[PDB]
Ligand binder design. Sequence first.
Ligand code: NAP
Ligand code: NAP
Ligand code: VVS
Lengths: 405, 412
Amino acid sequence: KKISGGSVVEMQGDEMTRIIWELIKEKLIFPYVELDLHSYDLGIENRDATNDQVTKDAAEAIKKHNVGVKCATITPDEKRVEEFKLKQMWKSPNGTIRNILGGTVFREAIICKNIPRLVSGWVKPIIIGHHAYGDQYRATDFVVPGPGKVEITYTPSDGTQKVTYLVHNFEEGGGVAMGMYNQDKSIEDFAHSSFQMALSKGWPLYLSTKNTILKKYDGRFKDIFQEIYDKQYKSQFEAQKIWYEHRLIDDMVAQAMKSEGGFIWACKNYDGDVQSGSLGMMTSVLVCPDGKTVEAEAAHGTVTRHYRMYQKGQETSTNPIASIFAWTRGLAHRAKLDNNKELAFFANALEEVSIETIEAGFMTKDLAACIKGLPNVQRSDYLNTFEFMDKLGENLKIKLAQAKL
Amino acid sequence: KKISGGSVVEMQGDEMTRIIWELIKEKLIFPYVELDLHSYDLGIENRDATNDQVTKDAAEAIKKHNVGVKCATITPDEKRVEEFKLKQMWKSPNGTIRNILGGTVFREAIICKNIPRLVSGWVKPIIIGHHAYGDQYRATDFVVPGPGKVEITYTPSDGTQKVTYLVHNFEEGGGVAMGMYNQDKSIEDFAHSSFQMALSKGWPLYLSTKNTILKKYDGRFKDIFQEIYDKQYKSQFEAQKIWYEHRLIDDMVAQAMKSEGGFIWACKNYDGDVQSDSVAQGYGSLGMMTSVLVCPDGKTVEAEAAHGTVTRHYRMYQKGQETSTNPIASIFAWTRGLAHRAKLDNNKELAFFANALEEVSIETIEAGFMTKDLAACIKGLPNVQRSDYLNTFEFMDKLGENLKIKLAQAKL
Ligand SMILES: NC(=O)c1ccc[n+]([C@@H]2O[C@H](COP(=O)([O-])OP(=O)(O)OC[C@H]3O[C@@H](n4cnc5c(N)ncnc54)[C@H](OP(=O)(O)O)[C@@H]3O)[C@@H](O)[C@H]2O)c1
Ligand SMILES: NC(=O)c1ccc[n+]([C@@H]2O[C@H](COP(=O)([O-])OP(=O)(O)OC[C@H]3O[C@@H](n4cnc5c(N)ncnc54)[C@H](OP(=O)(O)O)[C@@H]3O)[C@@H](O)[C@H]2O)c1
Ligand SMILES: CC(C)(C)CC(C)(C)c1cc(Cn2ccnc2)c(O)c(Cn2ccnc2)c1
């Protein structure tokens, strides 16, 4: 008999990822696990037909069932509106889901011993989580057309005296100015998600800020994380031989480079600054502050360029790893919530099979290019999308047979 | 006779870099060039003894003489205060010098054909620029202790046409808020140094902003850069088959991965130091990363390695243990400074020397003679053998021998 997997919210997607998502379910998941599957079709055509109601319903199902596994989806732009004759330029499903669930997104690149990394010494991945914006949240920027004062004021609701801070006195010429803010609740949610993420992995957590420059703004993140740690998580961390520390950004960057990895890094970037492989190896998880709800997905898109080749009947070599790890992370979380030992073993075995297959020299073109360099990759160095899924399927059957005896 | 090099401001530093700096002068510079050397000792003990007056005097000397070449220095922290029994936790000399000089910092990793790069396709380096804002430049941040309204207002000098913008209405708790700004003059100075660097190198220039999000704030950078390009640099760029293009970070990153390098990237970021740069701190070797502070005037340049004093190697050297410290970034601080001096003075012999030394440095590594950090890039640290590299002194001797040959060949 198959493993009884319980409740999983699954969101089908678009283009190349939609094809790979179906192959994963048919070849890797369904032959071994029976799920009470709450399946939502987030294909662009279905979101258009339902006036995006499907997206909202999927988000509510994740909130109820605690486990979401999502396929990459098309975020409409002008060209997509014309391509599908869309009724509206629908908002990103990821944006809609994040707004309903809340939480922090943690990204992790899957490491294979034979695949070159930025730091060769990295044996274990580094999991990065950013303090992001709640999609509707913004900064108030404007042009300063000429000389004059820019001030920022706070008027207490409690009737106490208003406080005025001079931002800059433009004495000659103009420029630009802006106002930014953060609510304590957002910082607290960021801290809770980071501590829950570290406890779940059994890895230490680092928070980096620029509190030497933004003494009040970044000092608040530093203080809130330390207050929550001391009160709610410190005993739990010590019990798992892990820790939490604040590090100044400059000091944090250098330490990660001389490290073997295996830590969570919560990042509070300097506000207003710009922030930005193989993408097929990058996983993503939205971790809600409750420590109960997660939504897992590949960090890449729908791979439109490969989908166009597939539509023409041309051979493709699309990496399914990030999509497989969305399934394994969701199933591992489900197993943890349900104390399901068989499901926990399966989720770990599938991750090991995926890494082992690549480490044995069977991989898609993107990874063969990492090893050989794109100018020297030959057809014999890689497997096409379907051949690679078949190899994973064969290795998974072998792994699960060895596990039985 | 030696080359008459003119006025150079030199700043001596600390630990392992202080040792390399002396080797560079003794083996590579002094046998060929005579300088009117304005030498400042920025060693930690001398900064402590002079109450940091030496740092301020060195900054004023660069402003007077236009050419600065600086050795890495210790930035005091609590452990350093205890180690040297320092009088105060002296501020970073780099911070003090940048505050006095102003300007834009450009960082460039030296490429050798046999050394792996982040992107294999890169044949020519990528030069990344960030503007160096003064210590007087800051965001105005504060704690919001409870519910209430945060607004930001602009009151023009004459008192008319005031505008008040709601930032946020804190309805359920407190948090934090801040006001930030940028002056047109700062953006214009950044644009001028960037366009000029692109022309001086004969390379295209790219600017990245988040103008799709900060439509007014980042739009101003895009427009000032675009205006100065269209008006003052468009024809010169086309003449050299080079171009200026604004690009979003996402687009910039993707293009760079498919690029062969050889371009200047101006990044609008406040937090732009190499220390917070995950790519620069984690790829190959910091021993190959150069830095140049380019002042708005186009006349003043301060060159330095974009790494520290290499304390870990200095500790081994103190125990009499063999070290293999890469002097490339330090040598290029000298060659960039001397090339700038040559340009200001129309000194053809000095310009030739500065270029010849850069060529010798790259050629030596390309011929398979390198320090351990580079041998580890090729072989991987666990598989490096002693025969794959040269120690600090052996590598400097090899460079010295190759420089002598190069300059002798150039004479005939
Ligand atoms: N989380 C999400 O739902 C999400 C996120 C981002 C974008 N999107 C959507 O995705 C669509 C396409 O976006 P995009 O083309 O900019 O991004 P993308 O799908 O991430 O693909 C960009 C390129 O990265 C490479 N790549 C990405 N994933 C790969 C994989 N699994 N295997 C092999 N190569 C892979 C391919 O490079 P080569 O072309 O060199 O082969 C591909 O053309 C858009 O409609 C966008 O809205 C969705
Ligand atoms: N511009 C400046 O004056 C400046 C800049 C940064 C830091 N600092 C100061 O420098 C001191 C030491 O800082 P740190 O140890 O954090 O940074 P670091 O001097 O840059 O050295 C960090 C590590 O990078 C490698 N490395 C750096 N430069 C190298 C070179 N030329 N050749 C070979 N390997 C090289 C070494 O790695 P391995 O250990 O693996 O060999 C070294 O231990 C501190 O007092 C700090 O304040 C000054
Ligand atoms: C073209 C552009 C934008 C520079 C992107 C690119 C190519 C990814 C890139 C390249 C280098 C240069 N480098 C290579 C080895 N050592 C230094 C960087 O320092 C950063 C830093 N960074 C990280 C994030 N943003 C900037 C990014």
